[PDB]
Structures are given as structure tokens and as C-alpha cells.
Design a protein around this ligand. Structure first.
Ligand SMILES: [Mg+2]
Ligand SMILES: [Mg+2]
Ligand SMILES: [Mg+2]
Ligand SMILES: [Mg+2]
Ligand SMILES: [Mg+2]
Ligand SMILES: [Mg+2]
Ligand SMILES: [Mg+2]
Ligand SMILES: [Mg+2]
Ligand SMILES: [Mg+2]
Ligand SMILES: [Mg+2]
Ligand SMILES: [Mg+2]
Ligand SMILES: [Mg+2]
Ligand SMILES: [Mg+2]
Ligand SMILES: [Mg+2]
Ligand SMILES: [Mg+2]
Ligand SMILES: [Mg+2]
Ligand SMILES: [Mg+2]
Ligand SMILES: [Mg+2]
Ligand SMILES: [Mg+2]
Ligand SMILES: [Mg+2]
Ligand SMILES: [Mg+2]
Ligand SMILES: [Mg+2]
Ligand SMILES: [Mg+2]
Ligand SMILES: [Mg+2]
Ligand SMILES: [Mg+2]
Lengths: 242, 125, 98, 173
RNA sequence: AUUCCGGUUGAUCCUGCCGGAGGCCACUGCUAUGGGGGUCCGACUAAGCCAUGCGAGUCAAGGGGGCGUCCCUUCUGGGACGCCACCGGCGGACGGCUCAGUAACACGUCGGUAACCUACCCUCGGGAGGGGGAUAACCCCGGGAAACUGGGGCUAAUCCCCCAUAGGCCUGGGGUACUGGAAGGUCCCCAGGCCGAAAGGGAGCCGUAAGGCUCCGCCCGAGGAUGGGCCGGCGGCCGAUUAGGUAGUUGGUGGGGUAACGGCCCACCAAGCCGAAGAUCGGUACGGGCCGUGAGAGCGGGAGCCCGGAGAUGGACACUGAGACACGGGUCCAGGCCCUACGGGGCGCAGCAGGCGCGAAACCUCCGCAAUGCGGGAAACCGCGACGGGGGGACCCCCAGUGCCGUGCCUCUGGCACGGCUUUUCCGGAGUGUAAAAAGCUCCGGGAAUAAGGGCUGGGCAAGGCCGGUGGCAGCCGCCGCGGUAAUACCGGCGGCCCGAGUGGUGGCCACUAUUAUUGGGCCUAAAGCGGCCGUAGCCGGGCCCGUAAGUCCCUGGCGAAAUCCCACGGCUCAACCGUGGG
RNA sequence: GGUCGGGUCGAGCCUAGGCUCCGUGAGGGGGGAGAAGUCGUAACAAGGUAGCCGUAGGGGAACCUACGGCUCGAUCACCUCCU
RNA sequence: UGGAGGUGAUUUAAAUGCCAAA
């Protein structure tokens, strides 16, 4: 990148969370800017071709996508560079199957089958919260999307809470607070994909991130970063997890 | 032309051999010496990222504010003094922090005319 | 290295050996310096003519220098007019351009 | 830095002319009918590697060490080099002859499919021997214990007929 | 394999260096049957110079034209269909090549930006009102040796320009709604100014028409994402026969400039800043992941694949754009070269092939967009010397061949004579394979038929006390040493030994070497204790009690890309190679 | 876009001075090999004047002499100090 | 028995190594 942005991506330099063969070819698909970041998303082409196996070559994968056979969060996606990330819902209505994208026990993305009824809701972590013109509150979620609420409910939402959103209408139906006893699922780090209940919260001076302690089903305690803990229920999960 | 990249001298006094050509994003521009004149004169500069700056070269009016929060548009007579440079007052150069005299008294400039395109001052009691 | 032959000489062995070792003076193409090169083999000097071009390499003594009873000679002849000298000594081949 | 360069899989002797080593290796070469010394050396290296793994794991402790120890034992007794009740110490008593007995050429000779080692090598190279329904033409392939008994003449070979003149000569031994 | 062997004497024991014996890399002599896999092949001298062909396009669903074929009527026309250039949009700043410069915030690693920019993409909240204008294409006339280029006429747009509104920025006075560890930040209300949007456009159906209903689109605000800019602490070469260096230099105050902080640049006020724990200067080099060697501690290198930096004949400087001071875009100087009708006009392969030169030192002026990706398009698609496929080459690694069996004879290892067998390999066919081919793989016919060399032969060091030449001559010899007419050492014959599709020569690095010694060496007589003493920094420092927790030890969060290394299992016949897991 | 004026930056070019590198070079100087053209016998035994270190003077050449020092000096007689 | 020091002295002149070993 001597004079401008990069447009290519070698196979050997691909993100380490993909299921891909790094020596079979030279190039890989450089993902388009979109909802999630690089470390927690994968292009749609690899889901269509390599994961599910509905296509053998890239050319016939693009023909499937252009016909609108794939839904991501209830919206038709035609771009083969579109990034798909954590907690998303992939629906194929013609075959009537649904999946949720989740990290593995070693940090790789996998598709977890879910029921049709559960496919209508998506959990969103409140990543930031700000005031906006006209004196309204804007919520910024972990996947980059935004929502607006009036000044009256400013005390019902804080950062690290989880909102259950009905897609594609984008209508709020539940708020899950972040506190002791809440049920959480870990998304990054050494303890990725472990789940449990919150026990303690600690804070540090001068901008160092804060840490939480979690107890699992077997009764073991482990620590992780607060921002890596994803609230999924009050005392039981509200969604299916592997 | 005007290059603002780095110094060619180490803090210990040793010299530095330049290791690359000058990048376009490191260049400066000619200073705008805002004079006092009968009529105002300004231009528009296209800047990095395709943005814009309004550069004022000649000034005739000013906005003067009082401690009560009210402002009036009055014209400039002359520059009494300017701590920035020793000979700006003689040449009637207006910069931030200069003292000017208007039809309603002395005032001190609070804006940057070369960056904003307007002259704002607070009234001196 | 590659060079051009200037003249033929002979060097006496050191004590207590006796004999004459046949060598040539070679001017190097790459920088113009003049060195001395030994011609290995029985009667090998008869295949060398003045103004021929030769390929020389190290003679293989201790510390990358001279060997045996002929100090002062650090190189030996390998090719003559792009033909291996060892073949010419054994036969199996004829020196080109007469 | 530098990219990967593929390396030799065998080691050469530290000194090329030692009388005792020459005699021992000549005896082995004559007995097992190998083509050249390097082939023999290849097998030697294999043996050494096993020993070097046993020595390192004896002086180790932890969680990964136990996994590697059991993996080494399982691999060694899968090849048929150790009995089913062997322990780690028994690794240090293997010899070069133990590995040479596992070559496909030797096993073909011992099973009675051939009269001589050289005939066994020729039979393997020309493609008359099938192992578990597959034709293999490498005389140095090491045979696993689980597949040793399923070694026969290829079902398409001329030798897969008891009336063949050459097979009857083999059976005569 | 955590190793020794030869050399100083008439004989002995030491110190000490030289040589042998091992691995890897570059060049090279002689000699060569086959297949597979891989990140190999003008890097070292010349980042020297280059003939010819190619290496970046795409959009007809943005807009007016030209030409052709048909249908309806047609004087005239209107349609439909297909090609062509032009205006217009996006891209051409990525990809590809090389290592000259650079000892530096260039690179590795942990952090920061509350001091910043970002076209394409995602979510939410809003908007699209009213006018104006030229010109290419096309027609008439041209100029010039050419490169290029003039005048007049006529026309459209998602082309260009105005007005309004929304919106943006600066400063002064209040209120305390948000995030955060902490507000020169965000939100609300007054006040003075300056800047200042848009294309309801295109396509298809239902529409008699009216108008819907989808598809692609245009503008503003808030946030994200992607790609970057800038800053800090720590870490990694050699020289004292280089000891003092610096004067916008170091800091402060007031400004300018920038996307943004900053002596980045000015005006004024001070005398600071670096240094024997090595400043300054000189030498040599792109940095890292890694690679070679060794029991390890270490020592040496960092061309090929990935990540970061820099460059486009040398030295300077700008236009457009979201992004450049731009390898196949522009200007000047310097230095080469080419075409001219002599007035002028052009060109630098460190892109793929190919040529000259320099050298010890390095390949075809080939086929394809079928796969992997990128740019363009609503899409089908089009282009791509990237990438993929072959051609030449003792580049590296893995698996094989040059026959096998039985009975006799011999000098019994090995050769010969009879009888039999097989076809890896070889010759000729069918299928499969491939973008098309070629290899490869499965079958069919013939037949032991088509296939062994290089070095050594006195000791070190495995192998002849045999024959013929030469006669201190010729020659050999890493080292020790042979040759003076009865040579196991030179030349040749016949034997023999080592490795084997390879085997020898020359140069370099590691080991050998405890001849660089932390582990782990020496200084009476062998190299080596200053002629003697006093003392500054540094290093090393007596016993007990109380406190602290910097060093040190244990547990646990966030990091140190992938490739490369080790192990088990799985896929190509096994392997080399590749995939899933654990380290 | 042309012409003039002003300010500022600036590759290159010329002159002078000072350091530094490469190629030749009359003449001078020791060093290393060779084998003997030459004059002597200085080091080894008490080497025929014991050898050697420091400083100074002299001589064809190894070398000689003076003052202070060492044993890495042979023989005889006497004396002294020890085991 | 074997050692370490000190003081005295110490009668003319007397150079060289060819041929060979080869
Ligand atoms: Mg490198
Ligand atoms: Mg001696
Ligand atoms: Mg070149
Ligand atoms: Mg570029
Ligand atoms: Mg360089
Ligand atoms: Mg306007
Ligand atoms: Mg380096
Ligand atoms: Mg290269
Ligand atoms: Mg070429
Ligand atoms: Mg080569
Ligand atoms: Mg012989
Ligand atoms: Mg022997
Ligand atoms: Mg040595
Ligand atoms: Mg020593
Ligand atoms: Mg002393
Ligand atoms: Mg002394
Ligand atoms: Mg103490
Ligand atoms: Mg501590
Ligand atoms: Mg890694
Ligand atoms: Mg298999
Ligand atoms: Mg396997
Ligand atoms: Mg792999
Ligand atoms: Mg004398
Ligand atoms: Mg004397
Ligand atoms: Mg005298």
C-alpha cells in the first residue's frame, strides 16, 4: 500500500477464524466493508460454496445469489463479498433451513442449526449510547447497526446490555440487563465459547479494561474481559446454544 | 515548497540523512496576511480529503462581543499592536490576539482569519 | 577465473627435492593483473601456446594458498581454449583450432 | 530469512572407512538383499528416531508428555514391533534387524510366496503381489500387523493359478 | 557418537599451530534409464543499455448520432433488430518487478490519538422545489514531411452553472441531557457572521387512459466498517591510530500553516541540549517471521515464500482525485539514443518472453481466461504475460530399473552351458484424463529384449609385496613424504576397495577447537602480572531485630498473524506432499 | 493566457580557498627467499677475553670498550649458613 | 649423607671443512 488502499488478499494472510485451505490456491476473497469487523465475520461466498456445498465453482455460486435464494437477518443479500458474523441468522426458505453463526471452541466460525421460530429474533449487544439532535438517544450495537429511542426511556438502556430485536422489522421486544446472576456466552479470548453466570465485576484505573468472573454449570470459576461477555438471558439462555 | 515533515537535526546535534522523497500530504501553504482594507476579499482552498477552507485576505468589518453576550457588526479602523510579530502593526496585519480599534472602542481578536474567513473580537473595557 | 597466456616459464622445486615444474604467466581479463599458474600432468605444457585463453582456479594448499614443493604458485590451469586439460593429457580429445 | 528447503531423510556415517562397521553392514546387505547402502541407512535412521523419542519422554512430566508417550507405544505396537503388553523401557532394546523384518520383500519371502529374496523383490516390482486388495510396488514398504495375513498374489496375475509352471516350482520348496 | 588420528627427537613427555575425517551453499571435469512432489533457475560483476509483440479495461438499463436487415403503412414516416465511434460514469494509487538509498521511530512488540482524513460497503433519521448554458459526435473548408492542430454551422444527457430551503464552520453568554478513568467532546436556548445540496434519472409490467407495483439509482445528518496518517516506552552491528559536539541549536511566550499535535516555520525572551554507561564522525548493510551447523551453551547468514519499507536513467517541481507529487500520465536541468523534407518531433523493460554488454556464473520472442481472484455491469457476461498449462535445465526431496528360477562345469564370490518364467522399463494400439493437448492411470500384442559410471589403491584410511616402461629426468605430493637403473608411492596393463545415476575439483560458513573458555582455558622455567605505591567511577562487601515489597518465586486475565518445526489419525499405491486435532 | 513590477524558495553553473582518493614517477630505504662470488670467526665446552640486559662512544662486518645489574656461568683453595 | 651462598685467583699462540652421502 504505497499510494492507496489494498484490494487483494493472499490465502496465507487470511483471517485465522475461517475454515479454508490455505495452500490450495493463491488468492482469497477480500471482504467488503459492512456490519462486523474482519476478525468476527466471513464472506458469503464461502458459506454458499465451501460450508454448505450448494455450489462447486464461484461462477455458479454467484448465479444462485443473484436469484435471491439467501436471506441474512431476513434481508436478501446478492453481494458475494458481504460479511456474515456472530449471532447472525442465515435462512434458506426454498429448502426451509436456518442457521446461527457462532464461534467454535477454538475460535472458528460454525453454523448451528436452529428452529424456524427462533430465526425471527437476533440478540444485539449495546456497544455505545449517545445523544443526537432533537434530543433523542441513539444506540450503537455490536454489529454496527443503530436505533433511536426517546428521552423518556433513557434509564432503561446502558452499555453491555442485550436487546432482542425482531428481524427484519427491527422492533424491540426484550431488554436483558448486565448484572450478577445473568447468563453470558464468551465470544473471544482463551475462554471462547464457554457459557455461564456472572459472579463478580472488577475495575481498574487509567483506562484499563474491566474484568468479569463467570461460573459454569460444573461450578468452576474463570475470568475474562467484560466486553467479551455476551448476555443471553436472565438465568437461562433465551436462544439455542451448542 | 513548504515542507513540514521532520527536522533534519537530532536532539543531540547530529545530522540526519533523508531516506525518502517528500510526500504530498506533508506540504504547507503560503501564509495569508490579512490586511485592513475598504472591502473584504476571500478565497476558498480545496484541502486533503476533498474538504474546504475559507481564507480571508482583506478585512473591512468585525464582530464585537460584550460580556452581556450581544454582538454588533462594525468596521475596522486600524491595528494598534500585535504581539505576534514586531512589525505587523505598521503593516496592518490582523492575526489572532491582535488589538484593533473600531468605531466603538478597542477590541481583541479571538478567531483565526486565515482558517475561518471571519474576524471576531471581544470588547476591551 | 579466465585469463590470457603471456609466456611459459619453469620453477625449481625446493630442497631437498629436484626438478623443474612447468608454469605459465596469465593476465586476468576482469582486472588486468598478472599471476602464475601451474600446469598439472605429464607433458601438459606441450598443449599450451602463447596467446591462448585459460581457466584457472586455486591449487588447494593449506589456508587457501600454495602446496607441496612449489611455494609462490597459488593457481593451476583447468581449461585451454574451452577444452578440459585433463582430457588433452589423457587423449580422448584434440585441441581445437590446431 | 530463508524459505523452507526439503531435507534428506537419512544420515551418513561419520567416517567412511571403518573396518568393523563395513563388515557388519556388508553382512546385513548380503542377508536382506538391499540395493545400496543408503537404503539400509534409511532404516537405521528410523530406529534412531524412535529411541530419541523414548529418551526424551522418560525424563519428562506433565500432561502432553503422557499423551505423546501413549501415542508412541500405540504406534510402535501397531507396526508389529512390540508385543501388546510392552512398556516404554522395551523401546530401548529394539535392533536394526527388527525393522528389516517388516519390509514387504522380507514378509513376502517368509510367507512362502517366493523361493528367494531376489525373486520376492522381482515379484513386488513387476506387480504380482496384492496387500489388502491393493497392488503395491515398493519393496521397502513396512507392513502393519493388522494387514499382514491379507497378502497374496494379485487376482489378475499369472501366478494366481496353481497350474502355472513357475508357481509349482515355488511350491516345491 | 557429548570421539579422534598424522606431523618438532637418535629415543621420551609437553605447549602450540597446520593437515585429515562430517554437513550445507555457489562455480566446474567426466558420465547418465524412469516416474512423482515442491515456496528452484541474470540475486553476487552492470539500479548498465535495449529492436520487435504483448502486460488495464468495462458499461447499449446515462445521451444524442452513423450504417445495415426486416414489419406496418409507406410520397414522407414509424417501429423492431444488429454493429460502430463519440460525449458521459467507474477503474487505471491495487496487482507485477528489483534491493540502489537508508544506522533511522526504518523494522519487531506493547500502548495512545480527548490531536486526524477516508470514494466503494452496512444501519437508522430526513430531502429531491424553480430557472439557465455550451459543446463532442455530425455537415462545409482546411494547415503540416510528420507528431499534431485551426475556422464556421447544428444538438442531448445521470454534462456544467445559478436561486431557494435543508445543512456546515467560527466567536461571545447561559442550562446541565450523554459517553467515559478523566471533557477544549456530544445535546438544549439566545446573539454576530461566513460558506452553502441534490438526477424522481433510467428499465419492465398492469394501465384504453388516468395512475400504480416492482428493479437499479441522486443529496444531507449520526454511527460503524475498510484503508491509512501521527506519537511514546522497550529490543537488535563494527572502529578511540575518531574526544569533545550543537547555535533554530534546547526550552519558554505570542502567532502562522496543516486533515491533525509538534521548532514544522516565524517574531521576541533565556542558556540550554548530547557525551568515556562512547556523543560526533567514519565503515558496512533494507528489517522480521526464518535458514545452515552443533549433544547443548553457542557461532554464521538473512536473494526466492509471507508481513513492513524504499525506487522507477541521476537531481529538483506540479495538475486531477477519496487516495499520487503517479513504472506502461505532465514540466525543467544533466547525460545518452532515434526519426526528419532540416523548420521540427520523440524514447529510458529494476513487467512477460527476447537481444547486446559484463563476467566463473542463470531458460520459450509458446497455449488459455476452464479454475483461484480483481476492475466494470441490474444481469448474462467481457478483460487480465496476475494466475493457471506446457517447453528448456544433473535446482531440492521421495519411490524404482539395468532381470528371476532350476540342473550341471569352472578358479566356485563370480562366470559359462542347457531348460523355463516375468514385463517395472522399451516399441505399437483402445479407454480415461485435459479449456484443447501432453504427461499420468486401467487394459491388449511383441520381446531379456532397450539401459553403469566416477574416484582411489605407501601411512592417516578400506583395498597388490604382481608384470612392463622412466632413471633426482619426467612426474606425484591437502600433511608426513616418494623418484639417484632391482620404484608395493610416477606412466601403463592385469587384479582389488568405496560409493553408485552419480562420482570428483575449486572457493565460503559451522563443527573439529576447552585455538575465545558464562557452562569451560591460561600467565616461575614454554605467548602472557604494569618497575613500585596512593586513590575517583564501577564491581564485590561482617552479625542480630523491626518494616517495605523494587529484584526473585507461585496463581490467573490480554497479547506475541499465517507459513515453517514435533506427534497421532486421515487422502493421493506407501512416501515426499496435503487436510483435521494436540503441542 | 501574454507583458511589467515586487517578495520568497530553488536544481544547476563559474571563481577562489581548504581537506581527501586514484594513476604514473627520477631518486633513496630496509624486508623475504635462492645458492655460494667474497672477507673474517661473534655464539654453543671455561667456545679458548663467561654469556646476557640498560645507557653512551667507537669500528670493513659479525663486534669492542666504560658505569650499574642478573645467573639463564666452568674449575681449584678457603670461609660462612643449613639438613 | 645431601644442599645453598661469599671472597680470591686460573703461565704465549692455535682460523677453517672440503671432497662424498646424491
Ligand atoms: Mg531478505
Ligand atoms: Mg625440540
Ligand atoms: Mg542487471
Ligand atoms: Mg503502484
Ligand atoms: Mg545497498
Ligand atoms: Mg447555492
Ligand atoms: Mg542485516
Ligand atoms: Mg530473485
Ligand atoms: Mg530471457
Ligand atoms: Mg547456475
Ligand atoms: Mg597402479
Ligand atoms: Mg588398510
Ligand atoms: Mg583445524
Ligand atoms: Mg591453551
Ligand atoms: Mg611486577
Ligand atoms: Mg615484569
Ligand atoms: Mg551480610
Ligand atoms: Mg516483585
Ligand atoms: Mg504461527
Ligand atoms: Mg490410499
Ligand atoms: Mg500416511
Ligand atoms: Mg499443512
Ligand atoms: Mg669465538
Ligand atoms: Mg667469548
Ligand atoms: Mg675503543
Amino acid at each position: 500500500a504505497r499510494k492507496g488502499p489494498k484490494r487483494h488478499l493472499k490465502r496465507l494472510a487470511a483471517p485465522t477464524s475461517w475454515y479454508i485451505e490455505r495452500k490450495a490456491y493463491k488468492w482469497a476473497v477480500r471482504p467488503r466493508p459492512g456490519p462486523h469487523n474482519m476478525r468476527t465475520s466471513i464472506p458469503l461466498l464461502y458459506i454458499v460454496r465451501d460450508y454448505l456445498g450448494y455450489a462447486k465453482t464461484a461462477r455458479e455460486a454467484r448465479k444462485i445469489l443473484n436469484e435471491g435464494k439467501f436471506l441474512v437477518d431476513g434481508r436478501v443479500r446478492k453481494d458475494y463479498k458481504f460479511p456474515v458474523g456472530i449471532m447472525d441468522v442465515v435462512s434458506i426458505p426454498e429448502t426451509g433451513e436456518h442457521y446461527r453463526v457462532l464461534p467454535n471452541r477454538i475460535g472458528k466460525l460454525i453454523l448451528h442449526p436452529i428452529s424456524e421460530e427462533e430465526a425471527n429474533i437476533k440478540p444485539l449487544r449495546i456497544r455505545n449510547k449517545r445523544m443526537v439532535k432533537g434530543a433523542k438517544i441513539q444506540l450503537n450495537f455490536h454489529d454496527g447497526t443503530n436505533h433511536l429511542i426517546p428521552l423518556s426511556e433513557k434509564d432503561n438502556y446502558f452499555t453491555s446490555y442485550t436487546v432482542l430485536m425482531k428481524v427484519p422489522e427491527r422492533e424491540i421486544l426484550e431488554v436483558l440487563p448486565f448484572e450478577k446472576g445473568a447468563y453470558v456466552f464468551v465470544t473471544q479470548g482463551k475462554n471462547v465459547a464457554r457459557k455461564g453466570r456472572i459472579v463478580e465485576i472488577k475495575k481498574f484505573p487509567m483506562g484499563w479494561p474491566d474484568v468479569v468472573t463467570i461460573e459454569d454449570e460444573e461450578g468452576e470459576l474463570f475470568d475474562t474481559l467484560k466486553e467479551y461477555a455476551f448476555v443471553v438471558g436472565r438465568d437461562k439462555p433465551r436462544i439455542s446454544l451448542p | 515548497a513548504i515542507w513540514q515533515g521532520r527536522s533534519l537535526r537530532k536532539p543531540s546535534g547530529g545530522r540526519i540523512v533523508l531516506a525518502r522523497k517528500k510526500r504530498k500530504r506533508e506540504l504547507g501553504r503560503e501564509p495569508s496576511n490579512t490586511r485592513v482594507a475598504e472591502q473584504d476579499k476571500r478565497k476558498i482552498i480545496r484541502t486533503y480529503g476533498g474538504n474546504k477552507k475559507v481564507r480571508l485576505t482583506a478585512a473591512a468589518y468585525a464582530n464585537v462581543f460584550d460580556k452581556s453576550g450581544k454582538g454588533r457588526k462594525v468596521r475596522i479602523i486600524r491595528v494598534i499592536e500585535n504581539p505576534a510579530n514586531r512589525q505587523f502593526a505598521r503593516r496592518n496585519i490582523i492575526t489572532k490576539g491582535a488589538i484593533i480599534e473600531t468605531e466603538i472602542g478597542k477590541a481583541k481578536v479571538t478567531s483565526r482569519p486565515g482558517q475561518d474567513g471571519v474576524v471576531n473580537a471581544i470588547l476591551l473595557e | 577465473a579466465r585469463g590470457i597466456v603471456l609466456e611459459k616459464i619453469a620453477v625449481e622445486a625446493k630442497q631437498p627435492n629436484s626438478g623443474m615444474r612447468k608454469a605459465v604467466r596469465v593476465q586476468l581479463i576482469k582486472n588486468g593483473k598478472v599471476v602464475t599458474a601451474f600446469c598439472p600432468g605429464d607433458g601438459a605444457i606441450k598443449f599450451i601456446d602463447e596467446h591462448d585463453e585459460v581457466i584457472i582456479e586455486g591449487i588447494g594448499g593449506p589456508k587457501g594458498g600454495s602446496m607441496g614443493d612449489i611455494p609462490g604458485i597459488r593457481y593451476k590451469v583447468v581449461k585451454v581454449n574451452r577444452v578440459s586439460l585433463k582430457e588433452l593429457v589423457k587423449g580422448r580429445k584434440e585441441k581445437p583450432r590446431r | 530469512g530463508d524459505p523452507k528447503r526439503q531435507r534428506k531423510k537419512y544420515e551418513t556415517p561419520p567416517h567412511p572407512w571403518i573396518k568393523e562397521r563395513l563388515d557388519r553392514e556388508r553382512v546385513l546387505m548380503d542377508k536382506y538383499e538391499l540395493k545400496n547402502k543408503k537404503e539400509l541407512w534409511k532404516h537405521e535412521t528410523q530406529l534412531k528416531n524412535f529411541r530419541r523419542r523414548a529418551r526424551r519422554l522418560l525424563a519428562a512430566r506433565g500432561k502432553q508428555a503422557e499423551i505423546e508417550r501413549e501415542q508412541l507405544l500405540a504406534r510402535l505396537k501397531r507396526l508389529g514391533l512390540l508385543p501388546e503388553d510392552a512398556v516404554l523401557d522395551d523401546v530401548l532394546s529394539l535392533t536394526i534387524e527388527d525393522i528389516l523384518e517388516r519390509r514387504l520383500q522380507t514378509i513376502v519371502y517368509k510367507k512362502g510366496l517366493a523361493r528367494t529374496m531376489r525373486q520376492a523383490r522381482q515379484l513386488i516390482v513387476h506387480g504380482h503381489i496384492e496387500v489388502n486388495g491393493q497392488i503395491i510396488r515398493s519393496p521397502s514398504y513396512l507392513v502393519l500387523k493388522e494387514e499382514e495375513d491379507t497378502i497374496t498374489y494379485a487376482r489378475t496375475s499369472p501366478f494366481a493359478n496353481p497350474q502355472h509352471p513357475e508357481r509349482m516350482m515355488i511350491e516345491k520348496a
